[PDB]
Amino acid sequence: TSWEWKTNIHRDTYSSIVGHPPLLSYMALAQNEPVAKFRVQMIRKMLQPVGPPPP
Amino acid sequence: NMFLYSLTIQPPTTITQALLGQFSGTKEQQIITASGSRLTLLQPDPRQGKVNTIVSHDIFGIIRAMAAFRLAGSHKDYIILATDSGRIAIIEYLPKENRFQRIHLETFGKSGVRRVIPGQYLAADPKGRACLIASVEKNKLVYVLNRNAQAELTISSPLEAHKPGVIVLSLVALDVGYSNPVFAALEYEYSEADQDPTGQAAKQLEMQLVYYELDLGLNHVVRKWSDTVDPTSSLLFQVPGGNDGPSGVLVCGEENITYRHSNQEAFRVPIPRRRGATEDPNRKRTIVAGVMHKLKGSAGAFFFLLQTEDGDLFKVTIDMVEDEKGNPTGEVKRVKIKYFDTVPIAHSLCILKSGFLFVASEFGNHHFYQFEKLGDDDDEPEFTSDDFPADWNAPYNPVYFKPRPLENLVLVESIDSMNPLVGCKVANLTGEDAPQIYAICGNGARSSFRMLKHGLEVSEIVASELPGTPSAVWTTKLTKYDEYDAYIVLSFTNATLVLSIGETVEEVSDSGFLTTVPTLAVQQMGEEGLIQIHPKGIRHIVQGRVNEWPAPQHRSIVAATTNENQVVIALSSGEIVYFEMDADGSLAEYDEKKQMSGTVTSLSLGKVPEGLRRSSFLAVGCDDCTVRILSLDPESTLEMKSIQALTAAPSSLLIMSMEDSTGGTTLYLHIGLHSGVYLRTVLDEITGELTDTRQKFLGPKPTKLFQVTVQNQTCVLALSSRPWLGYTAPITRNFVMTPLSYTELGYTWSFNSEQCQEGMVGIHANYLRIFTIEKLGQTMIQKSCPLTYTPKRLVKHPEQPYFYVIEADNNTLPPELVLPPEDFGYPKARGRWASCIEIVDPVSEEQPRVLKRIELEGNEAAVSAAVVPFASQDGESFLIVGTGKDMVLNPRASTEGAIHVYRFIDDGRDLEFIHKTIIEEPPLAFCPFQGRLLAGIGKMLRIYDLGLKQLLRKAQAEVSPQLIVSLDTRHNRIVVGDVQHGMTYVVYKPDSNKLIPFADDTIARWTTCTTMVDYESVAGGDKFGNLWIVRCPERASLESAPNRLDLMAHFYPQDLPTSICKTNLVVGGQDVLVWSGIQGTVGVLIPFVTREDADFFQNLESHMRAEDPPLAGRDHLIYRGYYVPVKGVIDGDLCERFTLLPNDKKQMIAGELDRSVREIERKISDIRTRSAF
């Protein structure tokens, strides 16, 4: 659907990953990275998760 | 229509946040921790160097943030909780009641963890004047906290500070002294990035530090100040303000620390890089956690402890310009970083005023350290803002440091944490009655293999030979004012031995030739004298002068119970003789004796109730399977008060008053049956009738009862095949019987001495022992051994007591090809894997041990494992390992997968590598299927057989929509767990050699673990914290995409399930579902026996939902049905909070449920102890 729709779905997903400590610990442990660093990666991804908008 | 009861065997042991505060109101400091949904209050002990848990409380919500604040002119901190309730809750701890109580609860939004609803961030003004709660985007709310005329807390309505497009990475409150409160935030706006169609406006971040000033006068909030900071900035920290320092925040980003306040210049310092040979040079690092501490007795005198992503702790300080004299000014000059010490990576760090550091590890055990601090003071290089460039883009030269063992800190306690719990299995590797729970957890070199055993931990002080097998023991004081009881007595089938305090003992008084049935010193407040009753008389000993009660009839003494002021004996004829005490002389025998229909098998007199002359009741058990209560009052002596019939002959009796769940002592009669049964009844204290019977089965041996004292609490010690301790739990306040992790005992008695107090003495098989149960409450004992890398799976040898763990640390080079990795971490390297197999022997020795390690190579990592028997090999079981090469998780990257095959040698104590067979993608799931191997590779379900040089395909098909993560099977049915699309039921057609999928899941489920409970249904969990059970419809089950599975149960434990299995936890044999959670939970789902029990616990759960709502304002039914509504499961964690209520609530619920309070208690305890523990 619209680029906006996909963008919102992804931003909601990243927000949820940062929000639920168990999931965040799971993913960060899988990557063997500190939980805070993974949290920062996820929050940073919210800028443009997918491609740039259409013109 | 309910059928499952959810209970918690082990609560989560993670700590996503720990906070320091004077929560008790005293000047002492306490620690508040968030463990998933548990709010826990801990008391550090500076003398013992340990930390003890004061209380824990299930929020029935998600604890996302915590803040502490103090009211003006008060010494007590309150706790603000930011959770998923959509509400802000402010709670207080009550030391008199040892419970949490919330003092404010106000709704500000809808429930859940959502993007635009605050809860993610929470900060509080240091002076306690206001607080700010915020979401990731974009809402912020400020609540003003004030003090009313009543001196109570008052909360204003929130003040909005929203701004669309704003993403927050960090939020801390500024210490502006008593100026207008200011909150600092790291923010970036995405509004521009959405407007640039191609090109960007992205791949770049315009991070700003923003100040939100709260004007208390005008009661509004405004973006007062802001500026651009380092785009890599991720953390903020509060620097002291007002007189204690210049207000501001350390901004922390990639190799960048900055003071960066509004009325000050910028001051940049870099992060030193490790100088190790394995350590990659020119590798930048960031900060993960940090603490600020202000030292007492001095202005300023503040430092920072900041932690790198490797776990290295650097001390940061601030130096300000001096005047003409030697005094500071408000202007800041430099920022000094100095290497401090390396500790595990932590979610929170806390510096106690008593000179300790509490480290809440993000993974693995938690750490408690004591400061020193010896460096040597300038042994470590120090680096300042002189003259590193305040500009982040400006060039500069890197700086290095050499890590080294602890100098400033000393470890004083390691705190058991099963976080992260990768998996567990339930199995019985010993002859013990209860299976054990084996679990793999930890991360890195701090990982661990742990075994949990249901029992109480007891420490044996001495042991000795006798050598003849004694049949009884006692300890007794010559005098009623001796704190240390003098004597220890033993009894054999034809003799008696007497000991005492000290190193060795022998005889001075007492009759040593004949067997002795009891020993007590009758006269409290009358120093002289013990009694030794034996067959054929009662010897009274007083300062060496001896006067004995003759038998004297042809009959002999067959049983006897003794009390301080009273003595009761039972003869072979069935007559009962009662002795009370005058001003001098224990021979005040009653003129009359009481005849019994049969032979007396047990007697219990009960201690003397203080403030009274004598115990009013006597318990008499007979061989006619009856227990009677006879009166001992003077007016109606030896008249029968009550009687009860029993399932078997009573072998033991013990009258004892214990603390009850309602805050006052109660008089109970413990009964021990000749069949191994233990009962506890209530003695009415007036009419002497017995009510509210509790039962339990302890073992085949006849149960015996004794009274001991543990932790200043009077407890019952029941001896059966095992020793069980019945006590009132200190925190949860219910009545528990837990077995001892100790040898079978035939006799025990309370023991005292100068060396140990409130200990115990017991005998078994030519041995005497002295032990004490130092601390109770923890019903699960845990033995552990370290592992090499972060575990992934756990499999058991099919016949021998051995385990095999596959382990894989991502983004780590093989340690090779001087610093202990558990203390400093393996050397990190991007894209490189470190993996290994380890064989674990958990039972053969006192502690689990790793027998052998098998290191992998070739950038190859283990991801799955199974023990599979092959028909082609006459049924021999082999070890199957799945691996991947050059694995990158996001996005998933396939160089190649592989399946190693190993063979069991030396009964499973070692492995022989057979052959390795390469495949397309890493195989995430294995499963034994009809004498051959089942593997899941990609979306591919594949059957292999064992060949001479490779595994050989025999059939395959695509079954799952995106990726296989789990497999299980019964008969011709295979159940396939997809990484995202839930379950898929496949059937195997032998004549056609086809794998046909015939059922799939309705909704998406990010499966993490599965098991088959029967042929038709599968129980599993998903990564969003759900447990569920799906089932194949009966119409589609006869078919041996097209059909949809039915949903049979669903439940939100909140913790992420990592493993699940169907097993039996108790000899009683009720099949249960045991599961484990990433945060440390070990839980059970228990099926109800009858519809009546299901109804009782459903209605009990409703009333507990009304009278004990979740602390943080959640709705319990909505919480347990976070994603999809609750189906089939009753939350027993809530039900078990019934014991915590005030008595009026208990009586109300007892009214609505039409059962007595003691009955509700008994059913709650019963459902747990019968089917699990």
Ligand SMILES: [Ca+2]
């Ligand atoms: Ca009472």
Ligand SMILES: [Ca+2]
């Ligand atoms: Ca090691």
Ligand SMILES: [Ca+2]
């Ligand atoms: Ca590939």
Ligand SMILES: [Ca+2]
């Ligand atoms: Ca209470």
